[PDB]
Ligand binder design. Structure first.
Ligand SMILES: CCS(=O)(=O)Nc1ccc(Oc2ccc(F)cc2F)c(-c2cn(C)c(=O)c3[nH]ccc23)c1
Length: 109
């Protein structure tokens, strides 16, 4: 049986696949509430999360384990579902990314 590190797999396989997805671009940096005109965002969302922050955490030895990283991805998706209206384009984009994420995480070593 091959021994492959879970956090390494999360960086090189999982994050890489999601980052390249056509719907990844609104999730590659923190939400810019000022430019997007969402003045209530940082009041409703208490733990903001994005793939750019996850990428930095994976590169800067932040995570204790793979589950702490998985929680950051889940926070990013649920923040989107909490803030935005169902049926909004951004929600449809997050749902497609979350479906791909769950597929990739099923094959985690
Ligand atoms: C890179 C971060 S950014 O903030 O610098 N750029 C950025 C650009 C577009 C965005 O969304 C859109 C998507 C598809 C459209 F057709 C129009 C949009 F505006 C969002 C965006 C992200 N997220 C997570 C939300 O929850 C959200 N709610 C409302 C906007 C958003 C963020």
């Amino acid at each position: 049986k091959r021994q492959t590190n879970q956090l390494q797999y999360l960086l090189r396989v999982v994050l890489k696949t999601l980052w390249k997805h056509q719907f990844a671009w609104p999730f590659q940096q923190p939400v810019d509430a000022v430019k997007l005109n969402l003045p209530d965002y940082y009041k409703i969302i208490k733990t903001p999360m994005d793939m750019g922050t996850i990428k930095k955490r994976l590169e800067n030895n932040y995570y204790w384990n793979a589950q702490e990283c998985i929680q950051d991805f889940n926070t990013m998706f649920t923040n989107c579902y909490i803030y935005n209206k169902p049926g909004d384009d951004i929600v449809l984009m997050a749902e497609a990314l979350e479906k791909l994420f769950l597929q990739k995480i099923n094959e985690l070593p």
